[PDB]
Amino acid sequence: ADFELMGVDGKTYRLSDYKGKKVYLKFWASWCSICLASLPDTDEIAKEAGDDYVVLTVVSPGHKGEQSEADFKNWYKGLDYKNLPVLVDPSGKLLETYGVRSYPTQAFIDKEGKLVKTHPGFMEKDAILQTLKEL
Ligand SMILES: [Mg+2]
Ligand SMILES: [Mg+2]
Ligand SMILES: [Mg+2]
Ligand SMILES: [Mg+2]
Ligand SMILES: [Mg+2]
Ligand SMILES: [Mg+2]
Ligand SMILES: [Mg+2]
Ligand SMILES: [Mg+2]
Ligand SMILES: [Mg+2]
Protein backbone atom coordinates (compact mmCIF):
# COMPACT_ATOMS: atom_id res chain seq x y z
CA ALA A 1 0.00 0.00 0.00
CA ASP A 2 1.27 3.45 -0.92
CA PHE A 3 1.97 6.25 1.55
CA GLU A 4 2.73 9.94 1.14
CA LEU A 5 4.57 11.70 3.95
CA MET A 6 6.50 14.91 4.29
CA GLY A 7 10.04 14.82 5.66
CA VAL A 8 11.57 17.24 8.15
CA ASP A 9 13.31 18.50 4.97
CA GLY A 10 9.94 19.60 3.51
CA LYS A 11 10.14 17.01 0.74
CA THR A 12 7.15 14.77 0.01
CA TYR A 13 7.98 11.06 -0.10
CA ARG A 14 5.79 8.38 -1.68
CA LEU A 15 6.57 4.68 -1.38
CA SER A 16 5.55 4.29 -5.02
CA ASP A 17 8.38 6.66 -5.99
CA TYR A 18 10.72 3.69 -5.35
CA LYS A 19 9.07 1.02 -7.45
CA GLY A 20 11.98 -0.96 -8.98
CA LYS A 21 14.26 -0.49 -5.96
CA LYS A 22 14.50 -2.22 -2.61
CA VAL A 23 13.59 -0.05 0.40
CA TYR A 24 15.05 -0.12 3.94
CA LEU A 25 12.66 1.74 6.28
CA LYS A 26 13.80 2.44 9.87
CA PHE A 27 11.06 3.25 12.42
CA TRP A 28 12.29 5.22 15.42
CA ALA A 29 11.46 7.82 18.09
CA SER A 30 13.32 10.72 19.68
CA TRP A 31 13.22 9.13 23.14
CA CYS A 32 14.72 5.82 22.05
CA SER A 33 18.38 5.84 23.09
CA ILE A 34 19.34 2.76 21.03
CA CYS A 35 17.70 4.41 18.01
CA LEU A 36 19.76 7.56 18.46
CA ALA A 37 22.96 5.57 18.94
CA SER A 38 22.37 3.75 15.65
CA LEU A 39 21.43 6.69 13.43
CA PRO A 40 25.07 7.13 12.36
CA ASP A 41 24.94 3.57 10.89
CA THR A 42 21.66 4.39 9.18
CA ASP A 43 23.12 7.56 7.73
CA GLU A 44 26.14 5.60 6.37
CA ILE A 45 23.87 3.00 4.79
CA ALA A 46 21.92 5.81 3.13
CA LYS A 47 25.11 7.58 1.95
CA GLU A 48 26.44 4.35 0.43
CA ALA A 49 23.21 3.36 -1.30
CA GLY A 50 24.18 4.25 -4.85
CA ASP A 51 21.49 2.74 -7.11
CA ASP A 52 21.21 -0.46 -5.06
CA TYR A 53 18.39 0.43 -2.61
CA VAL A 54 16.73 3.39 -0.90
CA VAL A 55 16.81 4.33 2.82
CA LEU A 56 13.90 6.06 4.58
CA THR A 57 13.27 6.65 8.27
CA VAL A 58 9.92 7.31 9.94
CA VAL A 59 8.89 9.04 13.16
CA SER A 60 5.28 9.22 14.34
CA PRO A 61 4.50 12.41 16.31
CA GLY A 62 1.80 11.95 18.94
CA HIS A 63 2.14 8.16 18.92
CA LYS A 64 4.16 5.76 21.13
CA GLY A 65 5.23 8.65 23.34
CA GLU A 66 6.69 10.78 20.56
CA GLN A 67 6.71 14.59 20.73
CA SER A 68 4.24 16.64 18.75
CA GLU A 69 5.14 17.32 15.13
CA ALA A 70 6.16 20.88 15.84
CA ASP A 71 8.25 19.98 18.85
CA PHE A 72 9.87 17.07 16.99
CA LYS A 73 10.91 19.27 14.09
CA ASN A 74 12.54 21.72 16.50
CA TRP A 75 14.26 18.94 18.50
CA TYR A 76 15.62 17.34 15.37
CA LYS A 77 17.63 20.49 14.54
CA GLY A 78 19.97 19.35 17.32
CA LEU A 79 20.90 16.23 15.33
CA ASP A 80 23.26 15.98 12.35
CA TYR A 81 22.51 13.39 9.67
CA LYS A 82 23.14 14.71 6.23
CA ASN A 83 21.96 11.60 4.37
CA LEU A 84 18.81 10.54 6.24
CA PRO A 85 15.23 11.22 5.22
CA VAL A 86 13.08 11.60 8.36
CA LEU A 87 9.46 11.17 7.32
CA VAL A 88 6.86 12.40 9.77
CA ASP A 89 3.58 10.47 10.25
CA PRO A 90 1.39 12.09 12.88
CA SER A 91 -1.41 9.66 11.92
CA GLY A 92 0.40 6.63 13.31
CA LYS A 93 -0.86 4.64 10.34
CA LEU A 94 2.45 3.28 9.07
CA LEU A 95 3.09 1.81 12.53
CA GLU A 96 -0.10 -0.21 12.10
CA THR A 97 0.60 -1.17 8.47
CA TYR A 98 4.09 -2.46 9.22
CA GLY A 99 3.16 -4.09 12.53
CA VAL A 100 5.65 -2.04 14.52
CA ARG A 101 5.59 -2.97 18.23
CA SER A 102 8.85 -1.47 19.52
CA TYR A 103 11.72 0.76 18.47
CA PRO A 104 13.80 0.68 16.47
CA THR A 105 12.14 -1.54 13.90
CA GLN A 106 13.84 -2.28 10.59
CA ALA A 107 11.52 -2.91 7.62
CA PHE A 108 12.59 -4.33 4.25
CA ILE A 109 10.45 -3.78 1.17
CA ASP A 110 10.95 -5.38 -2.23
CA LYS A 111 11.05 -3.79 -5.71
CA GLU A 112 7.25 -3.98 -5.99
CA GLY A 113 6.58 -2.19 -2.70
CA LYS A 114 5.63 -5.33 -0.71
CA LEU A 115 6.92 -5.92 2.84
CA VAL A 116 9.41 -8.81 2.98
CA LYS A 117 10.69 -8.60 6.56
CA THR A 118 10.58 -6.66 9.78
CA HIS A 119 13.09 -6.87 12.58
CA PRO A 120 12.41 -5.37 16.01
CA GLY A 121 15.51 -3.99 17.61
CA PHE A 122 19.06 -3.09 16.85
CA MET A 123 20.53 -4.52 13.68
CA GLU A 124 24.22 -4.30 12.81
CA LYS A 125 25.06 -2.32 9.68
CA ASP A 126 26.52 -5.24 7.71
CA ALA A 127 23.48 -7.38 8.61
CA ILE A 128 21.16 -4.71 7.23
CA LEU A 129 23.19 -4.57 4.01
CA GLN A 130 23.21 -8.37 3.69
CA THR A 131 19.47 -8.49 4.24
CA LEU A 132 19.03 -6.04 1.35
CA LYS A 133 21.27 -8.20 -0.85
CA GLU A 134 19.08 -11.19 -0.17
CA LEU A 135 15.99 -9.44 -1.57
MG1 LIG B 1 6.98 18.70 -0.59
MG1 LIG C 1 12.28 12.74 23.35
MG1 LIG D 1 16.21 11.89 23.35
MG1 LIG E 1 20.63 5.93 27.99
MG1 LIG F 1 7.58 5.84 13.88
MG1 LIG G 1 6.47 7.07 17.79
MG1 LIG H 1 3.99 8.01 26.52
MG1 LIG I 1 1.49 15.68 16.52
MG1 LIG J 1 16.31 19.54 10.35
Author numbering: 53 to 187
Q: What do the paper's sentences say?
A:
In addition, the molecular interplay of the surface-exposed TlpA (renamed Etrx1) with its extracellular paralogue Etrx2 on oxidative stress resistance and virulence are unknown. This study discovers the unique molecular architecture of two surface-exposed thioredoxin-systems, Etrx1 and Etrx2 and their redox partners CcdA1, CcdA2 and SpMsrAB2 as important pneumococcal extracellular reducing systems essential for pneumococcal pathogenesis and oxidative stress resistance. The bioinformatic analysis of pneumococcal genomes identified two genes encoding surface-exposed thioredoxin-like lipoproteins, renamed here Etrx1 and Etrx2. According to the accepted catalytic mechanism of thioredoxin-like proteins, Etrx1/Etrx2 would bind their redox partner SpMsrAB2 by means of a hydrophobic surface and subsequently perform a nucleophilic attack on the target disulphide bond via the N-terminal nucleophilic thiolate of the CXXC motif (Cys84 in Etrx1, Cys81 in Etrx2). Surface-exposed Etrx1 and Etrx2 deliver electrons to the SpMsrAB2 protein for the reduction of MsrA2 (by Etrx1 or Etrx2) and MsrB2 (by Etrx2) domains.
The Etrx1 model comprises amino acid residues from Ala53 to Leu187. Etrx1 presents a globular structure (38 × 28 × 29 Å) displaying a thioredoxin-like fold that contains seven β-strands and five α-helices. Besides the canonical Trx fold, Etrx1 has two insertions. The first insertion (residues 53–72) results in β1, β2 and α1 elements, and the second insertion (residues 112–144) gives rise to an additional β-strand (β5) and α-helix (α3). The loop connecting β3 with α2 contains the CXXC motif (84CSIC87) defining the nucleophilic active site Cys84 and the resolving Cys87. These cysteine residues form a disulphide bridge reflecting the oxidized state of the protein. The structural data clearly show that only the active site Cys84 is solvent-exposed and accessible for electron transfer reactions. At the beginning of the second insertion and near the active site there is an additional loop connecting β4 with α3 (residues 112–120) that is not present in the closely related family of cytochrome maturation proteins. Etrx1 lacks this cavity and this region shows differences in both the nature of the amino acids and in the conformation of the β4–α3 loop. In agreement with these results, soaking experiments with Etrx1 crystals did not yield a complex with Cyclofos-3™ even at high concentrations of the detergent.
